[PDB]
Amino acid sequence: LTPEQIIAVDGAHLWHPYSSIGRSPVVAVAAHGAWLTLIRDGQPIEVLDAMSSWWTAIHGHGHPALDQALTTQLRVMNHVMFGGLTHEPAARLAKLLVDITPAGLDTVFFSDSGSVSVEVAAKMALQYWRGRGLPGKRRLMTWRGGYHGDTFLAMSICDPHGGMHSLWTDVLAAQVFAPQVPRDYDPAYSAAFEAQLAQHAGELAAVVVEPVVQGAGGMRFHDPRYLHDLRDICRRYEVLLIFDEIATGFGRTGALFAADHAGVSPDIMCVGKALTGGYLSLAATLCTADVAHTISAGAAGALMHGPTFMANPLACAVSVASVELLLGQDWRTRITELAAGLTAGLDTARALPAVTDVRVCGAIGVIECDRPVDLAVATPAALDRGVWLRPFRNLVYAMPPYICTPAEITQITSAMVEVARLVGS
Amino acid sequence: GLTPEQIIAVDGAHLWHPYSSIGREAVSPVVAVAAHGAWLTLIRDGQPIEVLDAMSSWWTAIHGHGHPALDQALTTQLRVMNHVMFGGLTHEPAARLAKLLVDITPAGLDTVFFSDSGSVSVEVAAKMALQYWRGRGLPGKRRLMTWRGGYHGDTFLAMSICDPHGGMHSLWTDVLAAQVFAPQVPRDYDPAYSAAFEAQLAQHAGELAAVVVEPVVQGAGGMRFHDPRYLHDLRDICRRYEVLLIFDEIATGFGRTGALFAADHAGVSPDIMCVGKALTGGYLSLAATLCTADVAHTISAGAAGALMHGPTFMANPLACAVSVASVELLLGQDWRTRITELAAGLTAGLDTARALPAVTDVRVCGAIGVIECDRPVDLAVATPAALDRGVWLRPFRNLVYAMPPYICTPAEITQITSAMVEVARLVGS
Ligand SMILES: COC(=O)c1c(C(=O)OC)c(-c2cccc(F)c2)n2c1C[S@@](=O)C2
Ligand SMILES: COC(=O)c1c(C(=O)OC)c(-c2cccc(F)c2)n2c1C[S@@](=O)C2
Ligand SMILES: *Cc1c(COP(=O)(O)O)cnc(C)c1O
Ligand SMILES: *Cc1c(COP(=O)(O)O)cnc(C)c1O
Ligand SMILES: [Cl-]
Numbered sequence: 001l002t003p004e005q006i007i008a009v010d011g012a013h014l015w016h017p018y019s020s021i022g023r024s025p026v027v028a029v030a031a032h033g034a035w036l037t038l039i040r041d042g043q044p045i046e047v048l049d050a051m052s053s054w055w056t057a058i059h060g061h062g063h064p065a066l067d068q069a070l071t072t073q074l075r076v077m078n079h080v081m082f083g084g085l086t087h088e089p090a091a092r093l094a095k096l097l098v099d100i101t102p103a104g105l106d107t108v109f110f111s112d113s114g115s116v117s118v119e120v121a122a123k124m125a126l127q128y129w130r131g132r133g134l135p136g137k138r139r140l141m142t143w144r145g146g147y148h149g150d151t152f153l154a155m156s157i158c159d160p161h162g163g164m165h166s167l168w169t170d171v172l173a174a175q176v177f178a179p180q181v182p183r184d185y186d187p188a189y190s191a192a193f194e195a196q197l198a199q200h201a202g203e204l205a206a207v208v209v210e211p212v213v214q215g216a217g218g219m220r221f222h223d224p225r226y227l228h229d230l231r232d233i234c235r236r237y238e239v240l241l242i243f244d245e246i247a248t249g250f251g252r253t254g255a256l257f258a259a260d261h262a263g264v265s266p267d268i269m270c271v272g273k274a275l276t277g278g279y280l281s282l283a284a285t286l287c288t289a290d291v292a293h294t295i296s297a298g299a300a301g302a303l304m305h306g307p308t309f310m311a312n313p314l315a316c317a318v319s320v321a322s323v324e325l326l327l328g329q330d331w332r333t334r335i336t337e338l339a340a341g342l343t344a345g346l347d348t349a350r351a352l353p354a355v356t357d358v359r360v361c362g363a364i365g366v367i368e369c370d371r372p373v374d375l376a377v378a379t380p381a382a383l384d385r386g387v388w389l390r391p392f393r394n395l396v397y398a399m400p401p402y403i404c405t406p407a408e409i410t411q412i413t414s415a416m417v418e419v420a421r422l423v424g425s
Numbered sequence: 426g427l428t429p430e431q432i433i434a435v436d437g438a439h440l441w442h443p444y445s446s447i448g449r450e451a452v453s454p455v456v457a458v459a460a461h462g463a464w465l466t467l468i469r470d471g472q473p474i475e476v477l478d479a480m481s482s483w484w485t486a487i488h489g490h491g492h493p494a495l496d497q498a499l500t501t502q503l504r505v506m507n508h509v510m511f512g513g514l515t516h517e518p519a520a521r522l523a524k525l526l527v528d529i530t531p532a533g534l535d536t537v538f539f540s541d542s543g544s545v546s547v548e549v550a551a552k553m554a555l556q557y558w559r560g561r562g563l564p565g566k567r568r569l570m571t572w573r574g575g576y577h578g579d580t581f582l583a584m585s586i587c588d589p590h591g592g593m594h595s596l597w598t599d600v601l602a603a604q605v606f607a608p609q610v611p612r613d614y615d616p617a618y619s620a621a622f623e624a625q626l627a628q629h630a631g632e633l634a635a636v637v638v639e640p641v642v643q644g645a646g647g648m649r650f651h652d653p654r655y656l657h658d659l660r661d662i663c664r665r666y667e668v669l670l671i672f673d674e675i676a677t678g679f680g681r682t683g684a685l686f687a688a689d690h691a692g693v694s695p696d697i698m699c700v701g702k703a704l705t706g707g708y709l710s711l712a713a714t715l716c717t718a719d720v721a722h723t724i725s726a727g728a729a730g731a732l733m734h735g736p737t738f739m740a741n742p743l744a745c746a747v748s749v750a751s752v753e754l755l756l757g758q759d760w761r762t763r764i765t766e767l768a769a770g771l772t773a774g775l776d777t778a779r780a781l782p783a784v785t786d787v788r789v790c791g792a793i794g795v796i797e798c799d800r801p802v803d804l805a806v807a808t809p810a811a812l813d814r815g816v817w818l819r820p821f822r823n824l825v826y827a828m829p830p831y832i833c834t835p836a837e838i839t840q841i842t843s844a845m846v847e848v849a850r851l852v853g854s
Pocket of ligand 1: 081082083084306307308309310443444482483543578591645821
């Protein structure tokens with residue numbers, strides 16, 4: 001199909017994320033390394049994938065080690081049902097994940113998406129307490145500003161304004177919300193968290209939060225010491241702690257997992273997005289031996305979940321290679337250099353009239369503006385500078401692939417500054 | 426690099442399996458090391474043996490594993506573009522697949538929403554239905570109705586419309602949404618059942634967003650078949666009481682029941698439709714939800730202005746590419762003849778099971794064969810017995826059943842059915 005044919009089919013038949021039908025998307029024809037080939041005015045152009053294709057492409061696109069791992073597995077076994085059978089890609093990836101995740105996370109449940117992995121995490125927590133004779137422990141607690149997925153349980157712990165909990169009035173589970181976690185450490189926030197949690201301890205299965213960085217809820221950072229507090233509160237009140245690392249995982253925040261900034265091990269952990277280096281959909285939910293054994297000795301004798309494509313060989317194979325590629329290099333220095341690039345490149349944005357904040361955490365760079373960013377202005381402006389940038393609400397932000405050179409980062413940040421300049425005029 | 430023994434050891438310590446435990450598994454899982462065509466290579470007594478994939482790897486491998494045309498589709502896309510975000514971008518594999526899917530599904534399904542799994546597509550379908558009525562100023566229309574015996578996924582909303590016994594709702598007291606359940610749909614057509622379904626719906630109509638059913642074949646809820654005419658009655662009931670109709674074709678789609686989609690048996694179109702499982706020919710997780718123009722427009726003109734859903738990997742180019750090849754490969758051959766031949770093979774080969782003491786039923790529908798027994802089938806007896814005969818079979822509850830790849834030869838079906846018959850014999854004693 002020609003680009004124009006793609007556009008016509010797309011307008012008539014394709015739903016996009018969080019969009020309408022009939023209300024225009026740009027045709028993508030190739031991706032290699034940190035670059036996308038986009039069709040603009042009928043002409044192909046090379047642009048930097050500053051978004052990492054939504055947090056996903058940590059090693060860039062078409063990485064030879066990830067391409068090879070995919071075709072190698074494809075020669076041997078595309079997929080087998082995980083009911084009654086096991087295989088090497090599942091075992092290799094499970095061993096990897098157990099070894100590099102915070103200590104005590106010994107078991108691995110594979111699924112096909114972040115939202116599903118979160119539903120699995122919530123299921124683990126509910127079955128765990130049912131295994132302990134305490135079925136009253138069934139609500140969830142989080143702080144505001146969060147995002148945990150699009151499925152209906154997941155939605156219930158998303159920020160009530162963010163995921164607009166009306167028009168979902170009498171539809172979502174009614175969960176417990178503490179106020180927005182602030183950027184700077186404040187003992188009084190944690191004390192209030194504890195006091196509110198104390199009021200619901202007997203009905204709470206778990207606290208679920210994104211550690212250090214809150215992503216789709218507004219690219220906010222908080223002090224990792226709150227995570228230390230969350231761990232202590234959850235211990236003392238016997239509530240499980242769940243870390244949603246679907247966005248933060250695999251080095252993105254400057255640590256291998258964001259939990260590491262605090263030295264904290266959650267009881268349950270979700271990963272996804274960068275898991276496969278952005279080739280294929282995959283997610284994982286990990287829990288402690290204790291959680292696993294308590295579920296398994298319960299009335300059900302099992303975790304009552306099992307996606308059809310569970311532990312798909314092809315997805316697991318590329319993920320193994322993506323993880324090994326990350327571990328086998330000096331990823332910490334890579335991420336540190338990237339953060340300094342973002343920091344230096346975004347400095348001048350602080351002086352712009354419409355800019356309220358500039359913040360960087362690992363390979364995450366954020367220009368917070370004073371009004372919603374108009375995509376009809378922002379997207380073509382960044383395309384003009386040879387960069388794929390998609391703003392969100394009042395945020396001009398980037399999360400570049402790790403393979404981006406210093407020059408490419410500076411090109412990304414320039415385009416971000418120029419986009420921010422345009423919002424102000 | 427891990428050997429079979431190393432794999433078993435890592436797996437027992439660290440891997441969850443579907444609906445399983447950690448550390449309390451009666452039988453260790455079997456190491457699979459290869460899959461080609463209709464055969465899996467599995468490790469038994471430390472030795473690689475080839476056995477028939479009677480299950481199509483849980484309905485997925487319709488064209489079999491490692492099919493040259495699907496392999497090629499995947500490798501070709503890989504050299505060009507692995508993935509891009511579907512926010513603000515579109516691409517050729519998404520367009521091509523959507524166009525195919527719109528053309529080949531029941532008339533009136535004009536828009537396609539891609540996701541990563543069957544359960545997610547069901548939640549999207551529900552979200553479509555609910556947002557639809559909110560767009561009509563009827564936010565009270567928010568509950569779902571179904572008939573018992575069904576399966577729709579394992580995410581929490583999907584769980585709420587699964588059969589209350591099959592889905593173990595007893596373990597979920599006041600966690601799940603309370604939905605409206607009609608009695609088990611009978612095999613044989615009885616208009617009394619439809620009339621009672623309508624009366625039950627009529628009293629809930631003002632609070633129902635949608636009826637959600639598996640058309641013709643209920644899969645994970647007990648492999649039950651029902652007369653297609655019941656779907657014709659649902660369409661009529663939903664039309665007259667203004668309640669949307671959702672067909673869950675995640676198991677039934679793409680030729681499995683002898684028609685392209687199971688709805689085609691009844692000649693009826695749902696308002697919203699889910700597909701998955703066989704979509705990519707079993708290569709990769711991919712699902713879709715389709716809806717009519719009216720559903721799409723009403724959602725879009727509503728207060729929210731958009732469908733509030735968007736999986737990160739939405740419309741993945743690799744998954745979409747292999748799916749296009751899988752759909753085209755099915756459409757490019759006489760698939761209807763193939764499924765008729767398969768069904769005949771399944772019938773002839775399973776017939777002697779009807780006489781078996783422990784067998785209550787033998788039933789075939791397209792490329793699906795089922796032996797229902799009068800008691801649960803012991804996996805520790807059945808699995809070794811089928812392997813011993815060169816067949817991968819996994820019984821469920823009291824059922825011994827198969828959904829073989831469409832590429833199975835008559836001799837392969839003979840071999841599949843013989844193993845099934847035998848498993849059934851051992852259930853006697
Ligand atoms: C209640 O349904 C099931 O028990 C089930 C299931 C299963 O039987 O796992 C052994 C499986 C299953 C899932 C993945 C692989 C496999 F061999 C079997 N699945 C289901 C639901 S269908 O969506 C996926
Ligand atoms: C409220 O969150 C979102 O709006 C959102 C989103 C999006 O902004 O798509 C336009 C996307 C999104 C999803 C797929 C591709 C893409 F570019 C963006 N996603 C989310 C949720 S994150 O889990 C997936
Ligand atoms: C992206 C994301 C999810 C959802 O993942 P999908 O694969 O899009 O379902 C859930 N939680 C967090 C924190 C995320 O960043
Ligand atoms: C398999 C199935 C689902 C769920 O699909 P997953 O990919 O396992 O989440 C939903 N509905 C029906 C009818 C199915 O057969
Ligand atoms: Cl052979």
